[PDB]
Write a protein that binds this DNA or RNA. Sequence first.
DNA 1: AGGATACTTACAGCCATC
DNA 2: GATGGCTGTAAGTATCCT
Length: 1118
Amino acid sequence: YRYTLPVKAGEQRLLGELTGAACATLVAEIAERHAGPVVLIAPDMQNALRLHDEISQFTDQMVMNLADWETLPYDSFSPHQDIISSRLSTLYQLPTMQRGVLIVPVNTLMQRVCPHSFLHGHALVMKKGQRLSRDALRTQLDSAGYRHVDQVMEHGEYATRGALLDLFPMGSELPYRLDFFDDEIDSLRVFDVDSQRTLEEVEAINLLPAHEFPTDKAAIELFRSQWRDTFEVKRDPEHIYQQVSKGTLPAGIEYWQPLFFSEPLPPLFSYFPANTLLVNTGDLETSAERFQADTLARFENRGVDPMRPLLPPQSLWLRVDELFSELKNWPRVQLKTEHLPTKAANANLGFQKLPDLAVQAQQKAPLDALRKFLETFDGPVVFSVESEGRREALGELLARIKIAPQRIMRLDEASDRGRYLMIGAAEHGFVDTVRNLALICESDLLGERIGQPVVHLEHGVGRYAGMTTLEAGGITGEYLMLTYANDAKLYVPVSSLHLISRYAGGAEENAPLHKLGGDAWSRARQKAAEKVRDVAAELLDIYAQRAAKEGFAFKHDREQYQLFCDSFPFETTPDQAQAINAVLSDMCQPLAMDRLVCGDVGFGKTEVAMRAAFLAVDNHKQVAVLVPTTLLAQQHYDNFRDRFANWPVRIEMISRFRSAKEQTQILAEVAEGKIDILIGTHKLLQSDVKFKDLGLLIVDEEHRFGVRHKERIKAMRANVDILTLTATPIPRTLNMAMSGMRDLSIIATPPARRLAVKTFVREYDSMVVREAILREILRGGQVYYLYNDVENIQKAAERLAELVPEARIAIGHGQMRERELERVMNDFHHQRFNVLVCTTIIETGIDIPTANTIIIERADHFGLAQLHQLRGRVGRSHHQAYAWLLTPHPKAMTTDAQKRLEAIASLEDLGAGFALATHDLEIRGAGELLGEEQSGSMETIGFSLYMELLENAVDALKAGREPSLEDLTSQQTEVELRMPSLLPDDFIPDVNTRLSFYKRIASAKTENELEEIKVELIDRFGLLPDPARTLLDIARLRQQAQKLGIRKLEGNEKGGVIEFAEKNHVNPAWLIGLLQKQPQHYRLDGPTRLKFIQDLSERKTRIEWVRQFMRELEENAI
DNA sequence: AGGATACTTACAGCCATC
DNA sequence: GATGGCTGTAAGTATCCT
């Protein structure tokens, strides 16, 4: 209490001296101190996006928010089905709600409603409890706007089997199976279609109006009449209005739906109950005014297309004048974080500033800063948790100060200096005086940041069996089961794992066996040494000769760079920042240019090198590429001169239009040298390609041709250098030379449009293809289709256009006029033809934004570079993405098809191992003699050892002690404590999950590694009990002791022994000190080892001793 | 052991420019 | 009025090819 709120309309009980989520959860409380529901401003999306969970921490009640359109005013990108399902779900609960809250930003409120006319266009939620017809239902669905298919994935379609028919609901993300029985229906079930399983049995079904707008024949004809009432157009058939007057659907057409009726729909102030109330933040007025400014900017500057009516934004949407004038109807919460003038409306709530929270790892007790503050104030610390692992970590590092809060879920009651905790997710916090405490965590302190063969060093080559629980010699054992010689049964220490690798070879015989230790399996080391001789000598001459290659000085003037680079409208993934900064450091480095990269022809992963175009200015030198086509060539050209426009930018190219007149211009530019760039052609290279001042070059995909052109560009480097890559290189044998010949910047952004990618394969059929079409054509999507470009491609087109009598498939014929294909590319820019396809080497180069799908037609007549090139030319941003394939029957198709099918199964994502996917395929493409002698060996013995001999060869090349140490006879420190302790099967049955955990574990060596894996496993899989925590403390003592190099431990409460490091940082002062202090718990075995004795009853006692004494030893014994 | 088949310069016709 | 020129067929070639 002691604080009030407005109770009439236009009553601004304004608020000052405020805070972040503090005042947010405050107004949550005032939601408790309020009649019904309320709403608020959002200055932007991300703010409330965080803030949802921020208050959800400290609030019993509920709140959600709409989804923003995510398009832009007079853009062309179109919104999603899912956001709009969220929006309806958010709005039509208004007339249903009594308490709880919703939210919205300053922007989507100005957008005018597609109102309850939709809702009032019922139906709505229903059940099976009726003598109910489904023909009638589907009639109400075309009233709603769903349709028929054989299989459906999104809203707007459905499919029957027999007579039972199924669909996708909107308000629920689930798919549903619908359970028809002759009006004697009994059940109704949730279903997932990548599951192909019926899942969760429901009471009811939200049969809301099932589109963005329900649009039937008359609705359509009056949209048509409506445009005709506004303005008039031509009879040209690929006008968007004319097109949809043909009963059709492009993407951004939604943008005219708000002009469906004269009666406008100002914001949703119209809808709420009288009690509901408003909120300020930042500047609604200025945000809105600049919103207007940019919308109308976009209007006039983009008000240029003839086939696209740009429209009166005041007619479309609304303005601040009438917006504040309506919301006069209700009062608000006027909030800003500051002390203010004196007015009875004002609050000036008693919040103050947190202190500075610098804690530098360099120091001794930089931690204490808080602690020294603690005694000086009554403030409890019931503060944020972000996770269960965060609870664990933060508690243990609160034992670094000898405090341990008892997590209190409630908010303000806690004691003066009450030490408790709860969940949080914010960053910035403050101080209070009305409640004399703070709201902080480490954020403000420091912020953040299977049917398997297998190969194994010590004992050979084997295969999967699982894992052998057991009672070890007085303690538990849980070991791995490996299968080799004579049913070699191997129970294996899981702690081993790091010393084992995958099958790492080809399926023929590359895990033959091992029998008796000292044998060929250890001459694995011999051949590691011979690789370390020959190919390391190759590397030696390489980085002797390829390394130096000096260059020039390249002073930055960053200001003009990022003047020119602010325009990048993919607000970057910072890994891209790693990429640019490393490569420009190589640039600014006056030495050899080299950096190897792999990504996608997928946009984003294609253009960042063009930032070096800026670097190709100040030097005032030349660059180029061989775009193997002309199509991508002018694509590049266009986006360059757009991005790179208003300053001395001058390029022409080479095309397939290369007349003698073109060629004269080529002379003109290349012998001018002023001109910036050239862009290649199939017949570019051995032409005497002319340069005066050549900075550098980039290029990709020499695949089916020889490296003829690679050595020939080796001829094209007169006192100058290169900087190239490929998106889909070969086996990295040459690129692993580049791990030694050319460093790598293979960052290529996984994130920033990680979107749905639906890629499958099915048999030859008209109707299934047609189904794919009827998925993509609904906004003018796209697939692509193939042919030999030899036989009757036109009749392919004929059949296709025939099966789709309604659409416009174009002439996708390769080897016709560059003129004609250029027109075709214009239609790709425009899509006069809503559809077109593309086939072979001289056709297929790049992925398009507006496209969404592709299909394959002869993966029975296919090939190697076919796969590995089609993999690059697929992409889409911020919508669903798709693909399918065609097959004849695998009865007909051969091994090769099945190799590619194994590939297909191995297509899931660009996750951690897309490259590993390509690699196992290239084991399926087993014919490498790249590492010629090395190939058979590393296959037989494992590319594990390839990496091993790589590192040893490299480090000992620079150290010159090359042939063999390997730590192969010994590379691991050892430990035991007599702990019945291991991974529990409580959480998971799958053992390959456990293998994964052992992967991250035995691989891990660092505090961040282990704590991060801890947080992962605990939050995903709850507070898993003690023993694996003991395994992790074992991992940490391994971290310390093997950074030190200790040899062995065996432990127990009977005592134990240690083979201490014979080679560490010793200084025996502590040894004679503990002699004088303790002979029992320190009885040194000779000068040699160290037997010890403890009555440490509980394993907690054991580890506590172990921890404190490793710390003691860190201070002393080293 | 090539070999079906995918990139390229030259030969040469028919009619376009002056 | 005469070339020539600009496309098309095809030989040499050198990439698709399992």
